[PDB]
Symmetry: T
């Protein structure tokens, strides 16, 4: 895909992941409620920020960001979670895999943008890689 | 509808309106760009906050908030805007009508919750009414 | 009176009371100067804030707030004080009675607005009642 | 009971619950020490704030708040806990039930005050209901 | 006029101009609503601050500041505006002329106070001149 | 008494004195209302902080702080005040004597802890002595 | 006197007045202790700031500020107060007269500096006049 | 050009553009005065910051930054604007073209520095590209 | 010269002096590097602020501030420094003389503006005199 | 040992314990990752601060603090941990024992310094005792 | 001497040392002007704070602090410096010796107060010892 | 070396350099004490931060950071300084060479990580290069 296409598919993923973790946040139960409730809040707010950042990047490239939730559902690589009951460990296992997916895509974003000479998208992509790698490391350690 | 049902339909409206104004924000053009760009940012962030507030309210009542974007599209009373080109005046005219819709619904929320003896949802609903009435007044004055 | 009429008469009272306490502030003498000088500053600034709040409320209802000081003098229930010399105790006795008047009127505002289904003016009115009741309690205790 | 009587019994409950959770705070042991130690600090400080708020409300109504700890023990509906050893889960189970008791009483406070036309106590009571409902929801989720 | 007399007439102008711009603020309509609404807020708050400053100056000179709104209407050189409908350009044109009037008067204040050896009123007057000259320059540029 | 016993009796005094001054705070009347109302707020908040500090100290020594208000009433050296009406001078006279009592006890706390080699309780005790001596000096000067 | 000589005599007065009010501060007794204790703190800190300001002004003119307390006692127009017991009213009466003295001297400072074309000392002097006139007005009102 | 030469020519452009927009800032007239006046302030301050940043970069490379305004005029690619009267739209059109020029040059800076293995200048250059691309996007949207 | 002409020549000096000290800042060497590097930063930022202040003053008088760097070089009384190597002492000696020049000119500005009845430029000029006199005093002391 | 010798051995312990807990911090795994990761960060930063404090104390006594890591390893009483895998409970058990060691040593520091009349080291030592006793109490409670 | 007598002699020293270093501050010349000018400001402000602290301590003990500068000159152990010209090194050498004197006296203060059982003066004295020892160490290192 | 190996050797250097500059900090003497004392504090805190940053980077790559000070001494390229006496110039000369070493290594880190496609370590490395180049430039200028 071209840079702007990778960006638009990521923007779709971001809002879908926002919604998914928003769902986790309100439906988490058990002895680790307070840590997971707080963590999921930070995680979905991060996806919301990513949604905004990606839109900004698409616009600056001269293209239209996502127009509708319908378009987000069309472009997303992320499956919608319909469950309302889950274990806290499974939540973090799920989020971890979503992080690993995003990491793969941002690496591709970085490589594709560099080939096009899009220096600004490279910077953005590599900065997101840094944030993702920290998040992945912590979740992996927690689940170890 | 029962209180929690009104709340869930509002939560659906909130995210759909977030997306709609997010679209306006990135696609606004013309001599009033800077004022409308800034205003639309504040407006969609307000809808995002409403989304969170409504979810909180639904959860505290012992029900599940929206689980997916699919469910949001199912429950919403708001039509998705597919356009990417518009005049700044039309943006504010659209948002005004959306505000008027939300005002009607929050009034119903307030009345229904009071009848059920749900004092906390009444407070929340009336506070949202206050915010909506200010927003409506300003947009009406601007378009006058 | 209708809600907006009660509001406009209150707005008139607010500016007249602002002026009255502004006069007290600059003309207070005696051993309790520093406490009364400071208290009267806080009191007239409170009336100034009320003036603004009431104007906002009238405008949002689709009516015109006070246009002139002439109109304020016409609508006010508060007598203008022409004196420049007084005792600090008499100042607080006067202000107390003005507070009691405002309390009566805001109670009426709350009841009238509720009957009209004006939920936002009810909230505003009850919040002002809270502030007035605290002020009344302190002045009563001071004069006891 | 009249409004001021409900308020005085609540003020008694507040200080007794402050003491109870203060005891929990200093005597909690085990792997969840740090979360429960911190949570119990926030909880007893909340009861201390409630004690102050209720006193303020009683005074403004023209009555005397609690004068002594003896009077608090006389009026309280809350049993004093003499234990110094407990499990962290039992602490939260206890606090939950105390919250549910307070919720019942504040609902009664709200209804009784409204019938008397005491608009300010209604506002206070409904605001406390909001805080209690959030606390109850979180504890219920944690214990689920 | 003597210094204190110029000051008292200015104090009268300040509150009358406060009221006038307060009226503009709530009644402004049209595409430049948000800029004019905000500007008029800053302008009337400036007149309110001037009212306070002038009162302080009169008191420190051993005289009584304005006692009533009646006295303000008697002493003012500013005509009360009864209109509730106007164009945003006309608002700024009006305010500009009011600024030019105030500038003339503060220049006289400065000259008269210097002749009397009132060094403190000179400083105050010249500082107000600075603020007025900035405001005039901006309004003139806007209307050019 | 041993260190922890002195500490527990002080903790009992702290909450009883909190309650006593809380009572003074809400029931003070007269021309010095505002100064005494504010002073009594600071004083009872100081006793509340002392209650917390003493509990912390007892716990760190490996003992249980006060468990109940019943236990506080058993251990206290302070008489409960049942009055609701008093003069502001008598309030400060009472508090002064309570301060002098606390000063005696903290001196004993310091001496006893030093003999036991409890260096941390010595530091705490001497710091409280400093705070008490300032408070005593001011009240003595006020009543002189 | 020349400008720098007026400044040096003022610097001497400032430290002597600092000491005088420092003495008042620590020795004030009676029912108005807390207000006078606080006021005297602000007053002596003001004289300390004046001491620094005057030194700065003398240095910038190419002269040496006060070198010793001996030199301050030599140059001062202010009598040292040896008393340790006084009434709070007498304190404010004394300070008032000291303010009136400083006012006379700063007026002379302003006039002398202007004649020499020392524009910076004029600004400083007139600013100090403003501060003195406010202080005088408040003390006069308090003693009225 | 070598890296340091590109940097020095950019530093020259920065100060010339600072001056140009400084001129626009003070000479802008018309109904959009307040937005353009504010925007031009932010724009020239940005060029001033760029001037400083570029100087820092040149120095760290072991070369001398611009020594004089004469040298800036010699090295600049930007034409000096002698006009004092213009339309607000033309101002933004001009600035846009200047931004596009700077964008071209910073891209070259980034490429040249990378070829030399100057990793720090690459980072700086790409960061400036990001800022320029945002500015260009907004001006383009405004003029669309 | 007329006031606005003195101001425009000063504005020219300000930017030329900014550039001169900017050059010193980046080229200073030796054991006092860190103090001189920091001092020169503060000094050139001061000249930059003066440039802005003078422009503001010229505009408010109804004239055009400097339009170009060419015009600055034409109007300046300050010689451009082409050197890149110097001793830190010589830097401060140079800056001192530039300060003394500015002091002479601002004194003339103050006198000329007063004769014209331009009270606002007098205030500005005298305030700048104060800042210059402090700077001169410190540099003189350092070089003594 | 003399005071300075106890201090130098403590400084050695501090850096060795810093390193040990730094190792724990990065290698902690499991369901309590986030609490232990955060706690270990605070703990090693505390040891780093202690390292600095002890160095300061040694220097002020006229001796040289630790010069090298070699010297730290020579003087330390703490065994280096070579493991990279451990349970979170064992981490806290280890740290607890290290705290108990430090407590013993700081008690000796306090006693030895007092005998020498080193009042400042006594204060420092007793303050560290306070911090250690809190830390010990919390870890003991957590492991209970 | 008794505790209060040591304190009063120290209070005398504090103001005399304030004056001495105030003199140094304004009369320092040479290449190290900026460091010594700043250091002497911090030093004399420290002596001013000590003056206040000592007065507080004397008052709390039931005695009168210094009443006059005459009494300060009578009680002081510090010789007044009449010089206006000195080297920066000599300034620090002088201050060092003054610090060493204060250190001796505060050690005596600590010992004497402990013998009297004055725990609060011991704490104060030892805290001042800490501050003095840091200051001495830095000056000694600077002069080494 | 592989990326993680370069990182681990750098982490070893960081703590060894921390210790070295910590030693300089406490043992610096002479007329430039205050500047060098402060500079060395900032420098060793920078090395401490680098130690933490490098550990984070190693962990995120799935490897173990330094476990012990023994391992740091094994891996370090930096010679331990045993001296306690030195000239301030020699300190900065030493630190400069250490900076130049770190610069070489971070350049290698950047190149090696890029070849491996480790985009996050490249960003980190280049950011550290920027910080090092600034530090080197300042030290070189100071020693010139």
């Amino acid at each position: 895909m071209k840079t702007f296409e990778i960006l638009k598919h990521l923007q779709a993923d971001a809002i879908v992941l926002f919604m998914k973790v928003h769902n986790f946040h309100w439906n988490v139960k058990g002895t680790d409620f307070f840590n997971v409730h707080k963590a999921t809040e930070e995680i979905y707010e991060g996806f919301a920020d990513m949604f905004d950042d990606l839109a900004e990047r698409i616009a600056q490239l001269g293209h239209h960001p996502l127009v509708t939730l319908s378009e987000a559902l069309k472009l997303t690589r992320v499956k919608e979670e319909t469950k309302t009951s889950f274990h806290s460990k499974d939540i973090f296992k799920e989020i971890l895999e979503d992080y690993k997916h995003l990491e793969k895509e941002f690496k591709e974003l970085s490589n594709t943008a560099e080939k096009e000479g899009d220096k600004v998208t490279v910077t953005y992509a590599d900065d997101q890689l840094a944030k993702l790698q920290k998040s992945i490391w912590m979740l992996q350690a927690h689940l170890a």
